[PDB]
């Protein structure tokens, strides 16, 4: 479910927030996202 505050457990990564589509350029080996503050920003969907 996207655009709605939910609890996610993406591949064991637990957390809460809102998810949606993106226009990133995740390299094929990339799996996570972050910022200069080292906070999980983007998660690649395991089944999508």
């Amino acid at each position: 479910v996207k655009n709605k505050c939910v609890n996610f457990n993406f591949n064991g990564l637990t957390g809460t927030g809102v998810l949606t589509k993106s226009n990133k350029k995740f390299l094929p080996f990339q799996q996570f996202g972050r910022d200069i503050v080292d906070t999980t920003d983007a998660v690649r969907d395991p089944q999508t």
Partner: peptide, 24 residues
Amino acid sequence: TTTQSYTNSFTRGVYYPDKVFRSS
């Protein structure tokens, strides 16, 4: 056979340490 001539490396041989996307 083979040789063992030595050269310089310059800025080369840097790999993505993790699989965490980052930008700017």
